[PDB]
Every structure is written in structure tokens, then in C-alpha cells.
Design a binder for these strands. Structure first.
Lengths: 42, 106, 152, 47, 116
RNA sequence: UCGCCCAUUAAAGCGGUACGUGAGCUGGGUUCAGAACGUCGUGAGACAGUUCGGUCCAUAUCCGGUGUGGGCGUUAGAGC
RNA sequence: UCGGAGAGAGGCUCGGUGAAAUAGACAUGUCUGUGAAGAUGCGGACUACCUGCACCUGGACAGAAAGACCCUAUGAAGCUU
RNA sequence: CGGUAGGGGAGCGUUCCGUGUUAGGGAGAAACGCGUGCGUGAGCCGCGUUGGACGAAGCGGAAGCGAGAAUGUCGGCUUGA
RNA sequence: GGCCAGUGAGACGAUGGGGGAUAAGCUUCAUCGUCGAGAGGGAAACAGCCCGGAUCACCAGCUAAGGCCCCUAAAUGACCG
RNA sequence: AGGGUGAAAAGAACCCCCAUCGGGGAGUGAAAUAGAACAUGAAACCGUAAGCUCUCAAGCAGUGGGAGGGGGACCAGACCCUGACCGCGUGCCUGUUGAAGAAUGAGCCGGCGACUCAUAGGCAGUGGCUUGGUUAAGGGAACCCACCGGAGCCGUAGCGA
């Protein structure tokens, strides 16, 4: 139901950084597509 | 010195308890030399070797860094904070006068 | 001193965009080529990119006009996203009690950086270690020497 | 049962460590010859 | 004559924080928790300065014991100390243990001429 | 619950775990307001006496569990 | 008995917007022992790389409402003779 | 020369007043943040940066005078995410 | 005798008894210890048992209670059962 | 509930990104690390950068000891930051015979936030007078204040209804 304390610090950093790494993965994939956009594709 | 032992070699300084009666620059001889050593070292049978007396010079009589004494008891509103700077003395060792007694070392 | 003219701090701010959702994007482009960054930001799948892209391109145009150095040289040195000025709507909920929802904002800043401004000086220090060319008493070893300042 | 058991300080009454062996109770400190008189410590004569 | 407090609070709480500014996590940056923790730090310091005096001695004794057992097969710290006082010899544990490290020759020499 | 009884069966064991387990469920019993019977009470009201009717919350921070990834480690790196 | 299959609305994943009660501090294991007599924090052992996500609620004497029971106050208020 | 309730003695600071339209101060005050000075402590004292005009002592005086606890209270900002 | 306080819930242990079932970490008196208001060492942890009463400093020394195979200071000491 | 750009609006012509917002050069100004969200700008909270450092660990997070590494444009057995690994160490408050408590209270940070004042009675310290002491109202080129005002009060006799 309810939280007993707060996570407060450092743990919340660890939790957020993985979420930002989701963003990183998307960035890699979007970078990969730009080269595909250059030349061919038929 | 102040009921407190020290290994002591010449041309070299030490910190001790503040010597009551000692001036700023004023040479002194320590007559409680329980051991001497070299190539052929020399222990002691009794205390003091015999006529060995270490030769030193007082440097300065400044106080020690502050030690914080803190009385505390749980829940009784008994926080009591009190500093203490023990007065000390800096002394510089000039030379060891030779032993001439009981040669050990095999 | 080590740089000062290797940059231009374009700081487009009051962007209506939560700071964490901006840090998803900006954490990827901290230290990239500018060309590459632009190619990334148009293809990326984020609402976050558009205002960032606008500021990257504005910053690079700014750098090309104002301080007049090549866009192909430069990189994104310091990207940084800070908390803006928070607005607070009070929405209702079931059973009479009411809770706030916040419209968060941000202050985005980008420090661009030319690679090859202090390269004349750095490439000259391909000269190997025990050299100490003592000309002006010490002189101009002031160009991101990077590795050590062990000058005792 | 009907053996009420040892708890609180009543445990501490029973199972306290204690010697209770005549020889181990005696003993005390060790005796020595005291010592000849020793010199001062830090005689001055200077300045 | 209204008297605002202002200056007087955090000018002391800075000094409170100056202590705890090596502490790890919440303890370093949270006023009232720093105030709770500083006290405890000082208490553990004061308590452990007296633990120091006995614990160093206890180390030294172990050092000396370890040194002396390498001589004869049956010779042991307990006997060694009484053999020192049998000959009237006021070397304290610090010196004995430290020479045992830095100059084992000298412990050999003290061991040789105490037995006789 | 326990218990008695019917039909069985190799047998129909007895207990602890907050008389295991309601942030898992139920609400028949028992501790609210209504109403009645017997009784006690001059009366208001009462009675482990009886009867009918009567709102059971919760998005899991942590530990703990069932699953399942990622990192790093395994001293050059890998696939079996 | 004794479950099984399927349709929707969720749940799950991606993008957009974005709350809450709670929160001394939290680097927050199991066993038995101990203690205000029921311990993640004290003793001894045992077990255990660091970190997400999905699911589950046994514990944190979980959250919620300064117990509505019980009793106290030379408290309050209704009702009775 | 241990010390809860508790009593007695000795102090530190806070704003304002007398001294004082003092010296000290746009070659940098109040503040704000740092000190390998001092004190038994409350606190004091010098520093050059930010700051941009107020204002130390000493001897005295007066209080809206010292905060961590009140399910205090106002404002800010977290946690859950 | 003057001025001016808190206290008036006590707890355990030894003994002398009562009540109880010579049950209770039960209850009530009488005499004394400790806690309460007392740190430290012994008792694995362990208010109330044993030792001992913390003004402060020392990287000196002697000892009390209790201990000397290793975790973990000191005898894998001795002689007789 | 919500005050403080500057002395003066001198409140940013022009150029660049550009549909806007906003931004960077330019220009004004003592200052624009005073740009209108503008003066000093603390804490919590959110980051960015550098030094060291955690993935066989067990921990009220410190403390005593301190391995290895790093310094500060100022040559130290001195000092500071990190901290391999060891030993010790049962959050604070209230309130209890007894609380680490799984009893109560606080999410955190900053402010506000509690034995006061008037008049009398007792007592102590200090001062003045001691030819006993003292004035109240009231009067004062107002208020303080010299200087008047002796009306009263306290002490100078008890005993008994």
C-alpha cells in the first residue's frame, strides 16, 4: 500500500539513470537509421 | 621523561610533557637512559646504565592541538562539552654521552 | 584561462519541458560532433528533441556568425539542464479532496567548443617529455595541456 | 511441571562466573626487591 | 524593541556542519540530523581515546609474545616479564615491542643476558 | 470449532505456527443505531436470555517470495 | 464435483501529459539466543556479486482515524422518578 | 570535582538607547560565504572575494533576546515516480 | 532558625515473615545492597548479580573482580587425584 | 496573499538563429557575473566539472588505528581530500520501576513560536538618610528635571474580650 520511508537520495539516482539509458539506446538506434537514410533502399 | 619511554637518537627532536621550570632556549641532560645501542649495543642490568646522561636542548613550550572532551548521557539533557589543550614541550637531542659499561652483543 | 575563447554559451531558457525528460536526450549529446548531433536529433523519437535541436542549431549559427569559426570543427562540451519556474494547477479528485498537478519548466544551456583553436600549440607539444624550452621564463603552455599540471 | 525457572537478575545470581577454590582466592600481587634510589630525570645547568 | 533572530542561528549551524562535512549521505547535509550526529561522533571519539591506551598495550604484548616464543621451545611471555623484574629492568611494553620489530638483534641480546 | 448420524474406507490421528493466514477472501456468529418476546426495573432503561434487520478500504517504499533480464566478475578475447 | 475455451475494458510495451496517501535518518538478510518478556539495527552462527522489470502479500507490532470497548475526571450533554 | 528532579554561583551572545552627528567606512560598512588564530564553553578575532552603505569598541542601560521536537504554524522544496 | 525546591507510580536482590498453592519477572510490610540518578571491567548479548565510584591529558606502570587451545589479552604451566 | 532595474528609461537602433518565444554579438551604463522572471541572494532540493574510491558483501553509518592514491603558482618528519582492512559503537526527544525500542513526536530546509507586565505582601543584595525616615496627589517657559507640597505611612508600650 504505502511507503515506510523515503528512498531520499542516491537510490533515486540509480533508478533514474537506467531510465536515461533507455533514452541512450533510442539515440543509438536513431543514429543508425541516419546512415540507412543515406543511399539505396529499394 | 614524564613516566613515559622514548627511543632517542642525536640530531633529532621530540615532543614531551611541559617541563616545569624550563626556559625557551636552555640545554638539559636526561639522566634516566635505560638503554643504548650501536654496532655493539649495551643493555642495562639495573635501571640507568651508570654514568650515561643524554644531552638535549629545550626548543619551545607551546600547547598541544585541542582535544574535545564530551560528557554525554542518553535522554537526560546532559550534554557537556569541554576542550582541553595539554601543555607540552619540544626538545632537541644534541648527543649521547658514551657508555663505558657492560658491553653485550655477540 | 585554459580556454575562454573556445566556446559560446547559448542558453535558450524557459522551455516548457520537464527536466528529466530533457535529461533523457541531453545526456546522449554531451560530447559529440555537431553534425552527428543534428542527425541524431531529427530522427530520435522524442518531443524533447525539438527545442533542443533548435538551440543546438541556433548555437552553431551563433558561433559561425559571431566568433566566426567552422561548424565542422566544433563539438558540444558542456550540456546542462536546470530546474525552471514551476506552475501549479489544483485539480479535483474523487470525494471532495483536491491535489496539485505541476507544469514544470527548464533552463537549457549548451557550451559549444572548437577542436582546433589551440591545436597549433598542442600539436607543437608532440615534443617529448624532458624538454623544458625555457624562452619567456615559462611562456604560452596555456591551451588545455590536459594530462598533468605537475609544475612544482 | 512445577520447577519455576531462573530469569531476570535471578539468572545473573546463578550463572555469574566466580572462583570458589581456596588456592585461586589467595595469590594476589607478586613480591619483589623494591629498587636502589634513581637519579632526577632532567637536571638543568644552563643559560 | 522587536528582536529578529536572523544572524545567530546558522552562524552556529555552519560550525555544526563543519564537523560533519566528511560524513556519508543524509548525515552531512541535514541540519537537525547533523546536530544529532556530531554529538555521537564526539562521544565515540572520547570513548575510544581511552580504549586506545589499553588496545595499543594489548597489541604490544602480542608482538612481544610472538617475538620471544621464537627463542627456546618452552619460553613464553609470562615468564619473560617476571624475568625482567627479577633482574630489575624497567623497559615498558612499547619500547620492547618496537625494538622487537625494528631491531630483533637487540631482543636477541636482551634475551641472551637476562637468562644467565 | 466440537459433536451426533448416513454411506464409505488402508485409515477416517492429535497439536504449534497472534486458538497459522481479513493491506488474500467470506461475514453465517459475536461488540452500534431500528423493532419485538420473556423477564428485572415506579421510570428512563436493562438482561454471555431470545428473536428479525443491518456499509469489511488498500496503486507494494523496503525486507521476503515466484519468475525473468542487464551490468560487471571469472586475469587476452570468444563460440561450442 | 473440476475445471476449460473464447470476446471485450484494463493489465504489459512505445510515444505525449502526469498525480497521491506516506516519509527521524536509513549502507533496510535467515536462524536461534538476548532485551520493556514478539529484533534488518544487540550476541553467536548461517547464508548471501551489483542492479532493473513482471508478478505475489508473510513481516516492517505496514497506512488510515490523540480507541467508538474498558476505566479514570469531585469532565460535558440528553433522558427518568 | 559521576550525577535525573532540583537549588546556588560565574559568564557568552541578540536588537535597540546613553556616551556618539565618535574612528572606521565607495582606496569598500552591514551582510554572505571560508580560516593549518584564540577560549572551559556559549562565543571571539584577522582574512580577501561576492556585496554595495552603513556603523566597532570600552564603560553603562532596556528587552517582542537565544529553538529540534508542541499530530506546533507560514513559506519553500523533495520522496512515492 | 531564616529564604526557597523537587518528591509523594518506585524496581529488583539478601534476610525475617504475612497473603498465594511456603506458584509467579505475583502482592504487602520490616531491615540492608544496587538501579533509579552510575559510566568502566567480569558475566556470549543481559537496568537491578560480582568488582569498582568516570575533574582532564599520556602510543607509561601495578592490580580488583574474573581468566591463560583458536576466534579474542595472558601457561598447548607444573605435581597429585 | 502578492513591496525594493537604475542616479537618469539611457529599457537594448543594427546584425545573426528565427513563424513566435527566447537567445548571442552590437549599443547604452559606474555595473547588464543591474536585462524587466531585473537590488543583497543563506538552506533544503536539482544538476555539471575535477581528485580519490566501492560489484563476496552484513551495514544508526561514526569513531581509534590507518594500507594505497591525490594536493596548495608559497622547497613542511607540518597540513588537507580520499580511504584497503581492523577494533569499538543498541538515532534523538518526551517519559518511565524499566524505552535500541515494535511506546509517543518530527518528510526535509528556513522563518514565526512559550514564566511576561501592572499593582501590592514577604525575604535577600545594594545604596541614601539616622537632628528618626519618607513624602502622595498636586504645582513645574509640558515629558524628564531643579525646587516646593509633611496630608498621610512606617518606627518610638504593653497588657486584657
Amino acid at each position: 500500500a504505502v511507503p515506510k520511508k523515503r528512498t531520499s537520495i542516491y537510490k533515486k539516482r540509480i533508478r533514474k539513470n537506467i531510465w536515461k539509458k533507455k533514452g541512450y539506446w533510442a539515440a543509438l538506434k536513431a543514429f543508425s537509421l541516419a546512415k540507412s537514410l543515406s543511399t539505396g533502399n529499394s | 621523561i614524564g613516566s613515559r619511554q622514548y627511543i632517542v637518537i642525536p640530531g633529532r627532536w621530540i615532543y614531551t610533557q611541559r617541563l616545569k621550570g624550563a626556559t625557551v632556549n636552555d640545554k638539559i641532560v636526561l639522566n634516566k637512559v635505560l638503554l643504548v645501542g650501536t654496532k655493539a649495543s649495551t643493555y642495562i642490568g639495573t635501571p640507568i646504565v651508570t654514568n650515561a646522561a643524554v644531552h638535549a636542548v629545550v626548543e619551545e613550550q607551546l600547547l598541544d592541538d585541542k582535544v574535545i572532551v564530551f560528557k554525554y548521557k542518553k535522554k537526560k539533557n546532559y550534554r557537556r562539552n569541554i576542550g582541553h589543550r595539554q601543555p607540552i614541550t619540544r626538545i632537541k637531542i644534541t648527543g649521547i654521552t658514551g657508555y663505558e659499561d657492560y658491553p653485550a652483543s655477540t | 584561462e585554459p580556454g575562454k575563447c573556445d566556446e559560446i554559451t547559448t542558453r535558450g531558457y524557459s522551455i516548457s519541458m520537464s527536466v528529466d525528460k530533457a535529461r533523457r536526450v541531453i545526456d546522449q549529446i554531451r560530447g559529440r560532433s555537431y553534425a552527428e548531433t543534428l542527425m541524431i536529433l531529427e530522427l530520435m523519437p522524442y518531443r524533447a528533441c525539438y527545442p533542443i535541436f533548435k538551440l543546438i542549431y541556433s548555437a552553431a549559427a551563433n558561433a559561425s556568425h559571431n566568433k566566426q569559426f567552422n561548424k565542422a570543427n566544433l563539438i558540444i562540451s558542456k550540456a546542462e539542464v536546470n530546474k525552471g519556474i514551476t506552475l501549479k494547477k489544483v485539480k479535483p479528485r474523487a470525494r471532495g479532496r483536491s491535489y496539485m498537478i505541476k507544469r514544470p519548466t527548464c533552463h537549457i544551456t549548451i557550451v559549444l567548443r572548437d577542436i582546433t583553436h589551440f591545436d597549433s600549440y598542442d600539436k607543437f607539444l608532440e615534443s617529448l617529455t624532458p624538454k623544458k624550452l625555457i624562452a619567456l621564463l615559462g611562456l604560452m603552455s596555456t591551451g588545455r595541456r590536459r594530462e598533468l599540471l605537475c609544475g612544482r | 511441571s512445577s520447577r519455576p525457572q531462573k530469569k531476570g537478575t535471578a539468572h545473573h545470581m546463578k550463572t555469574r562466573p566466580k572462583k570458589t577454590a581456596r588456592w585461586d582466592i589467595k595469590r594476589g600481587p607478586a613480591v619483589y626487591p623494591p629498587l636502589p634510589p634513581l637519579p632526577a630525570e632532567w637536571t638543568i645547568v644552563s643559560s | 524593541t522587536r528582536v529578529k533572530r536572523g544572524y545567530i542561528a546558522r552562524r552556529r549551524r555552519k560550525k555544526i556542519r563543519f564537523f560533519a562535512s566528511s560524513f556519508r549521505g543524509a548525515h552531512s547535509r541535514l541540519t537537525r540530523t547533523i546536530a544529532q550526529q556530531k554529538i555521537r561522533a564526539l562521544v565515540s571519539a572520547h570513548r575510544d581515546r581511552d580504549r586506545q591506551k589499553r588496545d595499543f598495550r594489548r597489541l604490544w604484548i602480542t608482538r612481544i609474545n610472538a617475538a620471544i616464543r621464537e627463542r627456546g621451545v618452552y619460553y613464553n611471555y609470562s615468564k619473560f616479564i617476571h624475568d625482567l623484574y627479577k633482574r630489575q629492568l624497567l623497559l615498558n611494553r612499547k619500547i620492547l615491542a618496537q625494538i622487537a620489530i625494528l631491531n630483533p638483534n637487540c631482543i636477541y641480546m636482551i634475551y641472551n643476558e637476562i637468562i644467565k
